Amino acid sequence: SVDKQLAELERNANGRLGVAMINTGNGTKILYRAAQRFPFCSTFKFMLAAAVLDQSQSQPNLLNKHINYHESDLLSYAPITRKNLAHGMTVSELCAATIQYSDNTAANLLIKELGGLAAVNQFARSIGDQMFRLDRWEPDLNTARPNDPRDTTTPAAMAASMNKLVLGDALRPAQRSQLAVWLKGNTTGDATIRAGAPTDWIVGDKTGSGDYGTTNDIAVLWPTKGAPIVLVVYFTQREKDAKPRRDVLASVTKIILSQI
């Protein structure tokens, strides 16, 4: 019956919908096309920041390391790195800007620092995520073409990963806390999962947007009473020039939280 209104909401938006929710309080899950692949767009940046924090566990100085990027690293969507060009930015700051403003230059910088795309994939493999695959740099990874497995994951995989990283034992304590802190300071997420949750709840999320009207959001939610909820929602549409449907992500959140 969740099955139904989601099925319903999907046709209505003439899109494809993947949902994975993990209620950590009772072990319950809601899964919808959750083994299907979906272009992750900026949501991978969550995995990317966790990878940096992993590395930082054997590199005390890595997070304060100052990066002096040139003008040519700048992309269209790089508000924060643009702001700090003259002075540069620390690894930490870059992680923040990539999580909280979805800065694409910050992301590309963080991938170099780590040792390239494959380093991100190896990190995912290391925490038991078999589906996450990063194939292209920013900004080419947002093409989100139908049936293209490049730069995709499954809602289940990403939900499992976010659970491990933010609530479980995949990172060491300080790192794990920092990842949570970055997520809770996100500025891009007002109209998606946040919009579907009660305003007294605590939400930490990473959004992702792309071609084919791709509208994504992965979140951990802290309800006023009880243990936290992991919620991942991926949505994509028929035509390449589709307009985003952030409302759909809010609607899905409402549907899901109504069960619980």
PDB file of C-alpha atoms in Angstrom:
ATOM      1  CA  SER A   1       0.000   0.000   0.000  1.00  0.00           C
ATOM      2  CA  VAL A   2       3.046   2.208   0.384  1.00  0.00           C
ATOM      3  CA  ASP A   3       3.835   0.346  -2.802  1.00  0.00           C
ATOM      4  CA  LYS A   4       0.677   1.794  -4.257  1.00  0.00           C
ATOM      5  CA  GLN A   5       0.864   5.528  -3.566  1.00  0.00           C
ATOM      6  CA  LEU A   6       4.558   5.477  -4.617  1.00  0.00           C
ATOM      7  CA  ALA A   7       3.627   3.538  -7.799  1.00  0.00           C
ATOM      8  CA  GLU A   8       0.869   6.105  -8.127  1.00  0.00           C
ATOM      9  CA  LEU A   9       3.056   9.189  -7.517  1.00  0.00           C
ATOM     10  CA  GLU A  10       5.514   7.845 -10.081  1.00  0.00           C
ATOM     11  CA  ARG A  11       3.069   7.492 -13.015  1.00  0.00           C
ATOM     12  CA  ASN A  12       1.653  10.853 -12.063  1.00  0.00           C
ATOM     13  CA  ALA A  13       5.107  12.440 -12.454  1.00  0.00           C
ATOM     14  CA  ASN A  14       5.940  10.201 -15.466  1.00  0.00           C
ATOM     15  CA  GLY A  15       9.265   9.328 -13.881  1.00  0.00           C
ATOM     16  CA  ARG A  16      11.118   6.394 -12.367  1.00  0.00           C
ATOM     17  CA  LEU A  17      11.373   6.307  -8.566  1.00  0.00           C
ATOM     18  CA  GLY A  18      13.769   4.492  -6.263  1.00  0.00           C
ATOM     19  CA  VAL A  19      13.360   4.652  -2.505  1.00  0.00           C
ATOM     20  CA  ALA A  20      15.148   3.029   0.355  1.00  0.00           C
ATOM     21  CA  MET A  21      14.290   3.780   3.953  1.00  0.00           C
ATOM     22  CA  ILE A  22      15.960   2.126   6.933  1.00  0.00           C
ATOM     23  CA  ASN A  23      14.218   2.604  10.244  1.00  0.00           C
ATOM     24  CA  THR A  24      17.109   1.956  12.609  1.00  0.00           C
ATOM     25  CA  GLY A  25      14.802   1.972  15.653  1.00  0.00           C
ATOM     26  CA  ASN A  26      13.107  -1.346  14.742  1.00  0.00           C
ATOM     27  CA  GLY A  27      15.138  -2.740  11.785  1.00  0.00           C
ATOM     28  CA  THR A  28      12.273  -2.052   9.358  1.00  0.00           C
ATOM     29  CA  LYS A  29      12.804  -1.019   5.740  1.00  0.00           C
ATOM     30  CA  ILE A  30      10.776   0.380   2.900  1.00  0.00           C
ATOM     31  CA  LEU A  31      12.243  -0.381  -0.513  1.00  0.00           C
ATOM     32  CA  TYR A  32      10.952   0.717  -3.900  1.00  0.00           C
ATOM     33  CA  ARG A  33      12.865  -0.096  -7.090  1.00  0.00           C
ATOM     34  CA  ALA A  34      15.668  -0.184  -4.526  1.00  0.00           C
ATOM     35  CA  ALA A  35      17.829  -2.721  -6.361  1.00  0.00           C
ATOM     36  CA  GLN A  36      17.496  -0.687  -9.618  1.00  0.00           C
ATOM     37  CA  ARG A  37      20.332   1.600 -10.764  1.00  0.00           C
ATOM     38  CA  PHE A  38      19.841   5.390 -10.773  1.00  0.00           C
ATOM     39  CA  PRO A  39      22.225   8.224 -11.757  1.00  0.00           C
ATOM     40  CA  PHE A  40      23.492   9.531  -8.423  1.00  0.00           C
ATOM     41  CA  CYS A  41      24.413  13.075  -9.628  1.00  0.00           C
ATOM     42  CA  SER A  42      25.709  15.114  -6.641  1.00  0.00           C
ATOM     43  CA  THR A  43      24.759  12.443  -4.074  1.00  0.00           C
ATOM     44  CA  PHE A  44      28.082  10.691  -4.708  1.00  0.00           C
ATOM     45  CA  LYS A  45      29.768  13.672  -3.004  1.00  0.00           C
ATOM     46  CA  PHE A  46      28.511  12.176   0.232  1.00  0.00           C
ATOM     47  CA  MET A  47      30.608   9.058  -0.531  1.00  0.00           C
ATOM     48  CA  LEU A  48      33.497  11.273  -1.624  1.00  0.00           C
ATOM     49  CA  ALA A  49      33.623  13.175   1.643  1.00  0.00           C
ATOM     50  CA  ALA A  50      33.466   9.916   3.627  1.00  0.00           C
ATOM     51  CA  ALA A  51      36.402   8.700   1.533  1.00  0.00           C
ATOM     52  CA  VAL A  52      38.440  11.785   2.520  1.00  0.00           C
ATOM     53  CA  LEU A  53      37.585  11.260   6.162  1.00  0.00           C
ATOM     54  CA  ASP A  54      38.670   7.642   5.862  1.00  0.00           C
ATOM     55  CA  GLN A  55      42.008   8.751   4.486  1.00  0.00           C
ATOM     56  CA  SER A  56      42.318  11.480   7.104  1.00  0.00           C
ATOM     57  CA  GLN A  57      42.349   8.688   9.743  1.00  0.00           C
ATOM     58  CA  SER A  58      45.939   7.856   8.782  1.00  0.00           C
ATOM     59  CA  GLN A  59      46.859  11.465   7.848  1.00  0.00           C
ATOM     60  CA  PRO A  60      46.546  13.873  10.820  1.00  0.00           C
ATOM     61  CA  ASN A  61      47.403  16.909   8.643  1.00  0.00           C
ATOM     62  CA  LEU A  62      45.188  16.076   5.673  1.00  0.00           C
ATOM     63  CA  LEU A  63      42.102  18.050   6.820  1.00  0.00           C
ATOM     64  CA  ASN A  64      43.991  21.318   7.421  1.00  0.00           C
ATOM     65  CA  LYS A  65      46.044  20.873   4.247  1.00  0.00           C
ATOM     66  CA  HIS A  66      45.705  24.070   2.198  1.00  0.00           C
ATOM     67  CA  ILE A  67      44.773  23.581  -1.475  1.00  0.00           C
ATOM     68  CA  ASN A  68      45.776  26.400  -3.858  1.00  0.00           C
ATOM     69  CA  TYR A  69      43.621  25.775  -6.926  1.00  0.00           C
ATOM     70  CA  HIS A  70      44.004  27.822 -10.153  1.00  0.00           C
ATOM     71  CA  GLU A  71      41.237  29.722 -11.939  1.00  0.00           C
ATOM     72  CA  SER A  72      41.023  26.892 -14.506  1.00  0.00           C
ATOM     73  CA  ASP A  73      39.734  24.356 -11.924  1.00  0.00           C
ATOM     74  CA  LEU A  74      36.573  26.490 -11.612  1.00  0.00           C
ATOM     75  CA  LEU A  75      33.339  25.194 -13.115  1.00  0.00           C
ATOM     76  CA  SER A  76      29.853  26.603 -13.654  1.00  0.00           C
ATOM     77  CA  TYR A  77      28.663  25.347 -10.307  1.00  0.00           C
ATOM     78  CA  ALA A  78      31.425  26.266  -7.889  1.00  0.00           C
ATOM     79  CA  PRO A  79      30.092  29.124  -5.703  1.00  0.00           C
ATOM     80  CA  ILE A  80      32.355  28.545  -2.689  1.00  0.00           C
ATOM     81  CA  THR A  81      35.586  27.641  -4.485  1.00  0.00           C
ATOM     82  CA  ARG A  82      34.946  30.718  -6.692  1.00  0.00           C
ATOM     83  CA  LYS A  83      34.600  32.789  -3.472  1.00  0.00           C
ATOM     84  CA  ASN A  84      37.903  31.503  -2.046  1.00  0.00           C
ATOM     85  CA  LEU A  85      39.983  31.410  -5.250  1.00  0.00           C
ATOM     86  CA  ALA A  86      42.406  34.172  -4.192  1.00  0.00           C
ATOM     87  CA  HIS A  87      43.278  32.487  -0.869  1.00  0.00           C
ATOM     88  CA  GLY A  88      42.576  28.780  -1.547  1.00  0.00           C
ATOM     89  CA  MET A  89      40.834  26.326   0.832  1.00  0.00           C
ATOM     90  CA  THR A  90      41.659  23.491   3.221  1.00  0.00           C
ATOM     91  CA  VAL A  91      40.654  19.902   2.526  1.00  0.00           C
ATOM     92  CA  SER A  92      38.078  20.187   5.294  1.00  0.00           C
ATOM     93  CA  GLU A  93      36.611  23.402   3.886  1.00  0.00           C
ATOM     94  CA  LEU A  94      36.412  21.767   0.456  1.00  0.00           C
ATOM     95  CA  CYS A  95      34.517  18.802   1.933  1.00  0.00           C
ATOM     96  CA  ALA A  96      32.094  21.235   3.581  1.00  0.00           C
ATOM     97  CA  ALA A  97      31.562  23.210   0.401  1.00  0.00           C
ATOM     98  CA  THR A  98      30.973  20.051  -1.586  1.00  0.00           C
ATOM     99  CA  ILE A  99      28.460  18.598   0.900  1.00  0.00           C
ATOM    100  CA  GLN A 100      26.697  21.815   1.889  1.00  0.00           C
ATOM    101  CA  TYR A 101      26.715  23.899  -1.321  1.00  0.00           C
ATOM    102  CA  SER A 102      27.255  21.004  -3.799  1.00  0.00           C
ATOM    103  CA  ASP A 103      30.377  22.764  -5.109  1.00  0.00           C
ATOM    104  CA  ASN A 104      31.601  20.799  -8.190  1.00  0.00           C
ATOM    105  CA  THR A 105      35.105  22.293  -8.238  1.00  0.00           C
ATOM    106  CA  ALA A 106      35.526  21.294  -4.578  1.00  0.00           C
ATOM    107  CA  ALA A 107      34.512  17.733  -5.573  1.00  0.00           C
ATOM    108  CA  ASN A 108      36.952  17.444  -8.498  1.00  0.00           C
ATOM    109  CA  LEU A 109      39.725  18.769  -6.237  1.00  0.00           C
ATOM    110  CA  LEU A 110      38.841  16.179  -3.601  1.00  0.00           C
ATOM    111  CA  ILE A 111      38.988  13.391  -6.162  1.00  0.00           C
ATOM    112  CA  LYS A 112      42.516  14.376  -7.249  1.00  0.00           C
ATOM    113  CA  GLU A 113      43.694  14.610  -3.652  1.00  0.00           C
ATOM    114  CA  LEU A 114      42.384  11.100  -3.070  1.00  0.00           C
ATOM    115  CA  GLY A 115      44.064   9.612  -6.167  1.00  0.00           C
ATOM    116  CA  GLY A 116      41.317   9.755  -8.839  1.00  0.00           C
ATOM    117  CA  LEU A 117      37.866   8.279  -9.568  1.00  0.00           C
ATOM    118  CA  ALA A 118      38.957   4.732  -8.794  1.00  0.00           C
ATOM    119  CA  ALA A 119      40.009   5.739  -5.300  1.00  0.00           C
ATOM    120  CA  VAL A 120      36.387   6.693  -4.589  1.00  0.00           C
ATOM    121  CA  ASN A 121      35.185   3.342  -5.966  1.00  0.00           C
ATOM    122  CA  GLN A 122      37.704   1.472  -3.867  1.00  0.00           C
ATOM    123  CA  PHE A 123      36.544   3.296  -0.773  1.00  0.00           C
ATOM    124  CA  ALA A 124      32.943   2.289  -1.499  1.00  0.00           C
ATOM    125  CA  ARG A 125      34.071  -1.334  -1.972  1.00  0.00           C
ATOM    126  CA  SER A 126      35.879  -1.128   1.359  1.00  0.00           C
ATOM    127  CA  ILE A 127      32.689  -0.444   3.328  1.00  0.00           C
ATOM    128  CA  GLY A 128      30.821  -3.159   1.454  1.00  0.00           C
ATOM    129  CA  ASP A 129      29.073  -1.112  -1.269  1.00  0.00           C
ATOM    130  CA  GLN A 130      29.129  -3.175  -4.493  1.00  0.00           C
ATOM    131  CA  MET A 131      26.843  -0.971  -6.635  1.00  0.00           C
ATOM    132  CA  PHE A 132      28.357   2.547  -6.372  1.00  0.00           C
ATOM    133  CA  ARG A 133      30.369   3.334  -9.532  1.00  0.00           C
ATOM    134  CA  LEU A 134      31.929   6.749 -10.305  1.00  0.00           C
ATOM    135  CA  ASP A 135      32.871   6.893 -13.988  1.00  0.00           C
ATOM    136  CA  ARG A 136      33.317  10.561 -14.872  1.00  0.00           C
ATOM    137  CA  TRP A 137      34.432  13.825 -13.272  1.00  0.00           C
ATOM    138  CA  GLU A 138      32.276  16.894 -12.703  1.00  0.00           C
ATOM    139  CA  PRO A 139      30.500  18.011 -14.715  1.00  0.00           C
ATOM    140  CA  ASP A 140      30.110  15.083 -17.144  1.00  0.00           C
ATOM    141  CA  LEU A 141      28.576  12.693 -14.549  1.00  0.00           C
ATOM    142  CA  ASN A 142      25.136  14.434 -14.588  1.00  0.00           C
ATOM    143  CA  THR A 143      24.175  13.319 -18.123  1.00  0.00           C
ATOM    144  CA  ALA A 144      21.948  10.729 -16.421  1.00  0.00           C
ATOM    145  CA  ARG A 145      20.992   9.035 -19.675  1.00  0.00           C
ATOM    146  CA  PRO A 146      18.364   6.234 -19.658  1.00  0.00           C
ATOM    147  CA  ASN A 147      19.940   2.806 -19.011  1.00  0.00           C
ATOM    148  CA  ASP A 148      23.471   4.249 -18.716  1.00  0.00           C
ATOM    149  CA  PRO A 149      25.101   2.557 -15.674  1.00  0.00           C
ATOM    150  CA  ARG A 150      27.844   5.195 -15.474  1.00  0.00           C
ATOM    151  CA  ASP A 151      27.848   7.331 -12.323  1.00  0.00           C
ATOM    152  CA  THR A 152      25.046   5.342 -10.685  1.00  0.00           C
ATOM    153  CA  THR A 153      24.130   3.376  -7.576  1.00  0.00           C
ATOM    154  CA  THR A 154      21.031   1.732  -6.163  1.00  0.00           C
ATOM    155  CA  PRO A 155      18.882   3.271  -3.411  1.00  0.00           C
ATOM    156  CA  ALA A 156      19.508   0.186  -1.271  1.00  0.00           C
ATOM    157  CA  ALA A 157      23.268   0.353  -1.646  1.00  0.00           C
ATOM    158  CA  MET A 158      23.411   4.081  -0.872  1.00  0.00           C
ATOM    159  CA  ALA A 159      21.037   3.710   2.081  1.00  0.00           C
ATOM    160  CA  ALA A 160      23.219   0.893   3.479  1.00  0.00           C
ATOM    161  CA  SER A 161      26.341   3.009   2.933  1.00  0.00           C
ATOM    162  CA  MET A 162      24.868   6.105   4.630  1.00  0.00           C
ATOM    163  CA  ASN A 163      23.788   3.966   7.554  1.00  0.00           C
ATOM    164  CA  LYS A 164      27.281   2.485   7.949  1.00  0.00           C
ATOM    165  CA  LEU A 165      29.045   5.821   7.609  1.00  0.00           C
ATOM    166  CA  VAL A 166      26.793   8.042   9.713  1.00  0.00           C
ATOM    167  CA  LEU A 167      25.318   5.659  12.303  1.00  0.00           C
ATOM    168  CA  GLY A 168      27.492   2.509  12.074  1.00  0.00           C
ATOM    169  CA  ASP A 169      31.210   1.823  12.567  1.00  0.00           C
ATOM    170  CA  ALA A 170      32.658   2.364   9.066  1.00  0.00           C
ATOM    171  CA  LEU A 171      34.513   5.521  10.168  1.00  0.00           C
ATOM    172  CA  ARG A 172      36.376   6.306  13.380  1.00  0.00           C
ATOM    173  CA  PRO A 173      34.460   8.465  15.945  1.00  0.00           C
ATOM    174  CA  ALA A 174      35.599  12.003  15.178  1.00  0.00           C
ATOM    175  CA  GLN A 175      35.351  11.483  11.417  1.00  0.00           C
ATOM    176  CA  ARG A 176      31.898   9.939  11.700  1.00  0.00           C
ATOM    177  CA  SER A 177      30.748  12.906  13.730  1.00  0.00           C
ATOM    178  CA  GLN A 178      32.228  15.361  11.180  1.00  0.00           C
ATOM    179  CA  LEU A 179      30.369  13.646   8.344  1.00  0.00           C
ATOM    180  CA  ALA A 180      27.136  14.031  10.266  1.00  0.00           C
ATOM    181  CA  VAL A 181      27.918  17.686  10.964  1.00  0.00           C
ATOM    182  CA  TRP A 182      28.610  18.452   7.314  1.00  0.00           C
ATOM    183  CA  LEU A 183      25.271  16.844   6.367  1.00  0.00           C
ATOM    184  CA  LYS A 184      23.252  18.746   8.997  1.00  0.00           C
ATOM    185  CA  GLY A 185      24.625  22.066   7.690  1.00  0.00           C
ATOM    186  CA  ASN A 186      23.432  21.428   4.119  1.00  0.00           C
ATOM    187  CA  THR A 187      21.905  24.444   2.344  1.00  0.00           C
ATOM    188  CA  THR A 188      20.618  22.717  -0.825  1.00  0.00           C
ATOM    189  CA  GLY A 189      17.992  20.442   0.717  1.00  0.00           C
ATOM    190  CA  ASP A 190      15.116  22.715   1.829  1.00  0.00           C
ATOM    191  CA  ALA A 191      12.675  21.666  -0.905  1.00  0.00           C
ATOM    192  CA  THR A 192      13.251  17.905  -0.907  1.00  0.00           C
ATOM    193  CA  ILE A 193      13.283  15.539   2.081  1.00  0.00           C
ATOM    194  CA  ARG A 194      13.329  18.426   4.575  1.00  0.00           C
ATOM    195  CA  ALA A 195      10.066  19.748   3.070  1.00  0.00           C
ATOM    196  CA  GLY A 196       8.473  16.314   3.734  1.00  0.00           C
ATOM    197  CA  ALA A 197       9.640  15.957   7.339  1.00  0.00           C
ATOM    198  CA  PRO A 198       8.291  17.588  10.539  1.00  0.00           C
ATOM    199  CA  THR A 199      10.118  20.872  11.250  1.00  0.00           C
ATOM    200  CA  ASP A 200      11.078  19.754  14.783  1.00  0.00           C
ATOM    201  CA  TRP A 201      13.056  16.861  13.246  1.00  0.00           C
ATOM    202  CA  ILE A 202      16.816  17.087  12.610  1.00  0.00           C
ATOM    203  CA  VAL A 203      17.731  16.332   8.975  1.00  0.00           C
ATOM    204  CA  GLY A 204      21.103  15.882   7.305  1.00  0.00           C
ATOM    205  CA  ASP A 205      21.089  15.347   3.574  1.00  0.00           C
ATOM    206  CA  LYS A 206      22.952  15.515   0.308  1.00  0.00           C
ATOM    207  CA  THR A 207      20.972  16.444  -2.799  1.00  0.00           C
ATOM    208  CA  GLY A 208      21.690  15.605  -6.425  1.00  0.00           C
ATOM    209  CA  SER A 209      20.283  17.093  -9.623  1.00  0.00           C
ATOM    210  CA  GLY A 210      20.876  16.432 -13.304  1.00  0.00           C
ATOM    211  CA  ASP A 211      19.601  16.006 -16.837  1.00  0.00           C
ATOM    212  CA  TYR A 212      16.470  13.936 -17.451  1.00  0.00           C
ATOM    213  CA  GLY A 213      15.003  16.036 -14.625  1.00  0.00           C
ATOM    214  CA  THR A 214      17.026  13.953 -12.209  1.00  0.00           C
ATOM    215  CA  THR A 215      16.119  14.957  -8.641  1.00  0.00           C
ATOM    216  CA  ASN A 216      17.789  13.054  -5.792  1.00  0.00           C
ATOM    217  CA  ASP A 217      18.248  13.360  -2.028  1.00  0.00           C
ATOM    218  CA  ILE A 218      19.873  11.091   0.557  1.00  0.00           C
ATOM    219  CA  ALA A 219      19.287  11.852   4.208  1.00  0.00           C
ATOM    220  CA  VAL A 220      19.531  10.797   7.768  1.00  0.00           C
ATOM    221  CA  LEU A 221      16.615  12.080   9.839  1.00  0.00           C
ATOM    222  CA  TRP A 222      16.558  12.545  13.605  1.00  0.00           C
ATOM    223  CA  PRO A 223      12.955  12.393  14.915  1.00  0.00           C
ATOM    224  CA  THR A 224      12.233  14.186  18.184  1.00  0.00           C
ATOM    225  CA  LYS A 225      11.260  10.900  19.810  1.00  0.00           C
ATOM    226  CA  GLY A 226      13.153   7.744  18.833  1.00  0.00           C
ATOM    227  CA  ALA A 227      16.122   6.478  16.837  1.00  0.00           C
ATOM    228  CA  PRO A 228      17.172   7.904  13.434  1.00  0.00           C
ATOM    229  CA  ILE A 229      15.908   7.132   9.965  1.00  0.00           C
ATOM    230  CA  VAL A 230      17.934   6.731   6.810  1.00  0.00           C
ATOM    231  CA  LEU A 231      16.016   7.845   3.713  1.00  0.00           C
ATOM    232  CA  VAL A 232      17.269   7.766   0.111  1.00  0.00           C
ATOM    233  CA  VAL A 233      15.131   8.974  -2.820  1.00  0.00           C
ATOM    234  CA  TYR A 234      16.157   8.917  -6.497  1.00  0.00           C
ATOM    235  CA  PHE A 235      13.850  10.265  -9.198  1.00  0.00           C
ATOM    236  CA  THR A 236      14.435  10.665 -12.941  1.00  0.00           C
ATOM    237  CA  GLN A 237      12.245  11.439 -15.978  1.00  0.00           C
ATOM    238  CA  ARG A 238      11.574  10.660 -19.661  1.00  0.00           C
ATOM    239  CA  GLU A 239      13.099  13.573 -21.574  1.00  0.00           C
ATOM    240  CA  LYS A 240      16.551  15.093 -21.255  1.00  0.00           C
ATOM    241  CA  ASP A 241      15.271  18.634 -20.726  1.00  0.00           C
ATOM    242  CA  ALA A 242      12.777  17.685 -18.003  1.00  0.00           C
ATOM    243  CA  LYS A 243      12.247  20.249 -15.242  1.00  0.00           C
ATOM    244  CA  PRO A 244      13.174  19.029 -11.720  1.00  0.00           C
ATOM    245  CA  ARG A 245      10.464  17.712  -9.406  1.00  0.00           C
ATOM    246  CA  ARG A 246      11.712  18.433  -5.896  1.00  0.00           C
ATOM    247  CA  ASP A 247       8.039  18.391  -4.834  1.00  0.00           C
ATOM    248  CA  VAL A 248       7.988  14.672  -5.655  1.00  0.00           C
ATOM    249  CA  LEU A 249      10.823  14.018  -3.209  1.00  0.00           C
ATOM    250  CA  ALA A 250       8.896  15.917  -0.498  1.00  0.00           C
ATOM    251  CA  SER A 251       5.735  13.997  -1.342  1.00  0.00           C
ATOM    252  CA  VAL A 252       7.607  10.696  -1.106  1.00  0.00           C
ATOM    253  CA  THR A 253       9.014  11.669   2.281  1.00  0.00           C
ATOM    254  CA  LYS A 254       5.506  12.472   3.541  1.00  0.00           C
ATOM    255  CA  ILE A 255       4.219   9.111   2.301  1.00  0.00           C
ATOM    256  CA  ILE A 256       7.088   7.197   3.919  1.00  0.00           C
ATOM    257  CA  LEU A 257       7.026   8.983   7.290  1.00  0.00           C
ATOM    258  CA  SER A 258       3.237   8.359   7.526  1.00  0.00           C
ATOM    259  CA  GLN A 259       3.848   4.587   7.836  1.00  0.00           C
ATOM    260  CA  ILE A 260       6.274   4.984  10.704  1.00  0.00           C
TER     261      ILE A 260
END
